[PDB]
Each structure stands twice: as C-alpha cells, then as structure tokens.
Design a protein around this ligand. Structure first.
Ligand code: HEM
Length: 152
C-alpha cells in the first residue's frame, strides 16, 4: 500500500526508464544473469550466452528487456489496481516458466541497482523508498497467486 505521494515518486522515477527502455531493460537482465547465474538456466533462448560481452551484444536480450519493462511499467501505472494485468503474469511465471518468487526478489533488487548505476546522485532516498515499496507490492501480489496454485 502506497500513498499518492509515493506513487508520484514511482512514476517520476519511471520516466527515467521510459527515456531509454531498451538500455535499462538490457542492464537489468545483465545484472540478474551475472549476479545470479542460475536465473539464466530458465531461459532456453539465453542459456547459450556464456560471457557478459555476448550478453551485451545480444539484440534479442535487449528485445526481451523491452518486453519485461514494458509489462512492469503498465503494472506500475495502475497504482496498485493491477489485478487484471498481474494475473496472467503470475500464471505464466508459475505454470509455464516455473520462476520461483526468489527470482522476482532478485530482479527487484537489480532494478534498484541499475537505477543507481545509470542515474548516480539522481535516485534519491525518497525515490528509492517508493520504488522499493512498489516492487514489494508487485512481488507480494504475485506471491498470493503462487500460493493459490501451490507453486514453490
Ligand atoms: C519484473 C518482473 C518481470 C516481468 C514484468 C516479466 C514479464 C514477462 C513477460 C511480459 C513475458 C512474456 C509473456 C509471458 O510469457 O508471460 C515474460 C517471459 C518470460 N519471463 Fe518474465 N518477467 C519478470 C521477471 C522474470 C524473472 C525474474 C524471470 C527468470 C529469472 C523471468 C523469466 C521469464 C521467461 C523464462 C520468459 C519466457 C521467455 C521466452 O522464452 O521468450 N521473468 N516475462
């Protein structure tokens, strides 16, 4: 649960992402894959990537980063009223992709890391607080659907 002022911070930060969605999406995925190499094994289309240089050169990885962040941005713009947008993603991630909730924690922290890396000194303590709360809400509502499905 976020206040109006917190949502305002979230959507202000998101404007930074929307200025270069593919570059942010690329770096988020590279941070996830290099920090947590077990996550790469969930992607049949990226498992061939052995080095970060290969990851950086991959146009399909940048494409997938655009898909991921476009979906997250659509959810964030709902300011918590995201049941319809979140349900299909929870279902596909539990039943088809088999993504444990832990990996959603990993990517949440990766988003925070990339924001500081690309906007050093321009991602303030209030903005980090609000973004973290928004990603926690997203993860918690997915977790509720995972529990319904019995997925671990
Ligand atoms: C911010 C969180 C994320 C968002 C919004 C997101 C969004 C999406 C979307 C929109 C798709 C395509 C449609 C679908 O299959 O449902 C997708 C595919 C996928 N997601 Fe996620 N995702 C997230 C996190 C992750 C994480 C953490 C992993 C794994 C570590 C992951 C693994 C996958 C895989 C394996 C695919 C299928 C890729 C394919 O082969 O083309 N997702 N995701």
């Amino acid at each position: 649960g976020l206040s109006d002022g917190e949502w305002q911070q979230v959507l202000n930060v998101w404007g930074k992402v929307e200025a270069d969605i593919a570059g942010h999406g690329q770096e988020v995925l590279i941070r996830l894959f290099t920090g947590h190499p077990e996550t790469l094994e969930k992607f049949d289309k990226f498992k061939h990537l052995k080095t970060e240089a290969e990851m950086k050169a991959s146009e399909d990885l940048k494409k997938h980063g655009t898909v991921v962040l476009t979906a997250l941005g659509g959810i964030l713009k709902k300011k918590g009223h995201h049941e319809a947008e979140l349900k299909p993603l929870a279902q596909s991630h539990a039943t088809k992709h088999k993504i444990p909730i832990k990996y959603l924690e990993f990517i949440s922290d990766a988003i925070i890391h990339v924001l500081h890396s690309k906007h050093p000194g321009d991602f303030g303590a209030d903005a980090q607080g609000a973004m973290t709360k928004a990603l926690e809400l997203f993860r918690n509502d997915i977790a509720a659907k995972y529990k319904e499905l019995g997925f671990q």
